[PDB]
């Protein structure tokens, strides 16, 4: 956050005096919201998975919408999975509050790993959304005869008293109480601060009542504070995200040829095949694309544990011997190039357990 001095030197048409003030405002340049992308492949359907979050320990934020806009380059894919929030959705810095945002992409012709996608998430800060509630629902509620008199002190109230109110966001989260932290503001000092400037006695009285109420903890929880966001401009964070620069894309399927006790093998036929045709890059059946089955402490392999891929559709029988008692996952498989390259593999049976029942 940085300070910044503005100064105006403006004349006037009707008046001759060369007016213009010199203000010194603070600006919090740190971006509140944070987004981390995760990518998912499956055969011919792609899946984006964004973990929205906050980037300040003591500044929860609220989400309105995160509709993933497609690029404008061409008549491209049919996105789906846009989220429009019926009510503002809370989100903290960390904890068990992972606000996932998932999108399903299915192609029409193929994928090019050079395009872009713009998220365009609209958010707002809890501090702003909950300061508006106090400054509109506790001071000037249901009155115009009051507001026409109070409005001459508007911008002072929103810059020299309200801005310093540090909140008990924990209390709001847990019990939904609008309460200040104990060491927030010296009540006597801020009570004195308003006297020096001239003020209508009624306005001083009502602001005193409001400050006392906020310090005593008005605690409307869910019956309200969904109507006052209407007059708060949100903030956009249109962020670009790009598909990965993978070179090749295989998928591997473990057919179960022809429950299963320990020490007796289960036959399988693995089918590795390169579905790179539907991802822009043409197939390359000559690269150094060793494919290996990572035997673990709870499985054992018999047959070809590793082989170099040099054909579009490779397959070979492999036998699996259990070691552990029961309900084991399949062994993992990996395909890492030898020279310098990287690729990706869709293990179709990645999450599929097998029950081993001894004797």
């Amino acid at each position: 956050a940085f300070d910044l001095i503005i100064k105006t030197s403006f004349t006037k048409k009707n008046d001759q005096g060369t007016f213009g003030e010199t203000k010194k405002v603070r600006i919090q340049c740190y971006l509140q919201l944070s987004v981390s992308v995760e990518d998912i492949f499956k055969k011919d359907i792609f899946f984006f998975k964004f973990l929205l979050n906050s980037s300040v320990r003591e500044e929860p934020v609220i989400l309105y919408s995160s509709e993933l806009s497609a690029p404008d380059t061409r008549n491209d894919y049919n996105i789906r999975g846009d989220y429009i929030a019926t009510t503002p959705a809370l989100i903290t810095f960390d904890g068990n509050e992972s606000f996932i945002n998932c999108y399903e992409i299915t192609a029409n012709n193929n994928f090019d790993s050079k395009d872009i996608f713009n998220l365009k998430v609209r958010y707002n800060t809890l501090k702003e959304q909950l300061d508006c509630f106090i400054t509109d629902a506790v001071l000037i509620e249901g009155d115009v005869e009051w507001f026409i008199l109070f409005e001459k002190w508007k911008t002072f109230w929103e810059l020299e008293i309200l801005k310093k109110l540090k909140y008990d966001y924990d209390a709001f989260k847990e019990n939904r109480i609008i309460r200040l932290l104990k060491t927030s503001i010296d009540l006597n000092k801020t009570k004195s601060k308003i006297r020096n400037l001239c003020i209508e006695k009624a306005v001083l009285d009502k602001i005193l009542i409001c400050l006392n109420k906020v310090s005593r903890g008005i605690a409307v929880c869910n019956t309200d504070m969904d109507e006052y966001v209407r007059n708060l401009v949100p903030k956009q964070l249109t962020v670009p995200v790009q598909l990965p620069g993978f070179e090749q894309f295989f998928h591997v399927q473990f057919e179960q040829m022809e429950i299963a006790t320990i020490g007796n093998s289960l036959s399988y036929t693995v089918i590795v095949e390169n579905l790179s045709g539907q991802w822009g890059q043409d197939v390359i059946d000559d690269g150094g694309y060793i494919f290996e089955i990572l035997s673990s402490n709870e499985w054992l392999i018999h047959g070809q544990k590793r082989c170099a891929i040099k054909e579009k559709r490779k397959e070979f029988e492999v036998h699996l011997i259990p070691l552990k008692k029961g309900y084991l996952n399949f062994p993992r498989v990996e395909i890492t190039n030898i020279n310098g390259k990287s690729c990706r593999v869709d293990h179709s049976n990645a999450f599929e357990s097998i029950l081993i029942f001894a004797a």
Partner: protein, 264 residues
């Protein structure tokens, strides 16, 4: 060399038999040599090994006896570069490690005239819960049919065979508690633990609760025949809850660890 190989034997005490698994791959020496000498001009070459015999022979003194593999392995097989092949053998296990020999007869196929043969061999040594015991006592417990699979709701029977040889008879009592144990942690682990406890508590139930085992005279056995019924499909590996307490010193031995019920 160009067949970097190892033997990764692992023991199955439950099966009472050790599985010796050998695995051999063409090595980085071959990876260098194929570009260095075989086809330096061609961009990316590959070896052409052909295994004509893979033999596992257990040996001692003048004795030398082969051992067959677990699964069918075609003897006259091929092999290219970056390849790794594994095979497994079973053998029964206390204070005398075995002695084995692995022999690999193969031959390269540099052109289909020149076939450099090899007979590489080496030998080494085979180097590396269900029956429960009672604490502060001698008695031993084992279910006769430890692993049992049945269908949902059909009552089934076990036989908790007992060995007692300590000094004197006992009046131990076996019972199953269908009460959710108290959890002690993030919610992602707390509810995992609670799901485990709840399934244990109200999955399987005993038709012979508070079955006072009548008498077990010293240096004798007993068949505490139990009867069950399941109501929630799943796999109750080492089922808890079934605990037996002795009315001599208030033990709480977890005798239920010797059962692996599976109700569908």
């Amino acid at each position: 060399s160009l067949l970097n190989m190892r033997l990764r034997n692992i023991s199955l005490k439950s099966e009472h038999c050790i599985l010796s698994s050998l695995d051999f791959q063409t090595s980085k020496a071959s990876e260098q040599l194929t570009k260095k000498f075989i086809y330096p001009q061609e961009h990316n070459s590959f070896l052409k090994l052909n295994f004509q015999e893979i033999s596992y022979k257990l040996i001692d003194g003048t004795s030398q006896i082969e051992l067959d593999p677990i699964c069918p392995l075609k003897v006259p097989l091929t092999a290219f570069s970056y390849d790794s092949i594994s095979a497994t053998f079973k053998l029964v296990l206390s204070t005398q490690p075995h002695r084995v020999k692995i022999t690999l007869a193969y031959e390269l196929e540099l052109h289909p005239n020149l076939k450099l043969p090899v007979r590489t061999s080496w030998e080494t040594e085979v180097t590396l819960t269900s029956l429960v015991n009672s604490k502060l006592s001698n008695v031993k417990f084992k279910f006769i049919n430890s692993n049992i699979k049945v269908i949902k709701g059909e009552k089934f029977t076990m036989r908790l065979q007992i060995i007692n040889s300590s000094s004197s008879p006992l009046d131990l009592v076996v019972y199953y508690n269908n009460t959710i144990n108290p959890i002690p942690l993030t919610l992602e682990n707390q509810y995992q633990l609670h799901n485990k406890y709840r399934k244990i508590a109200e999955g399987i139930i005993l038709l012979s609760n508070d079955y006072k085992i009548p008498v077990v005279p010293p240096r004798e056995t007993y068949f505490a025949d139990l009867r069950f019924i399941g109501i929630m499909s799943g796999y109750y590996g080492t089922l808890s809850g079934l605990k037996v307490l002795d009315l001599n010193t208030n033990e709480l031995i977890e005798v239920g660890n010797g059962a692996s019920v599976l109700i569908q």
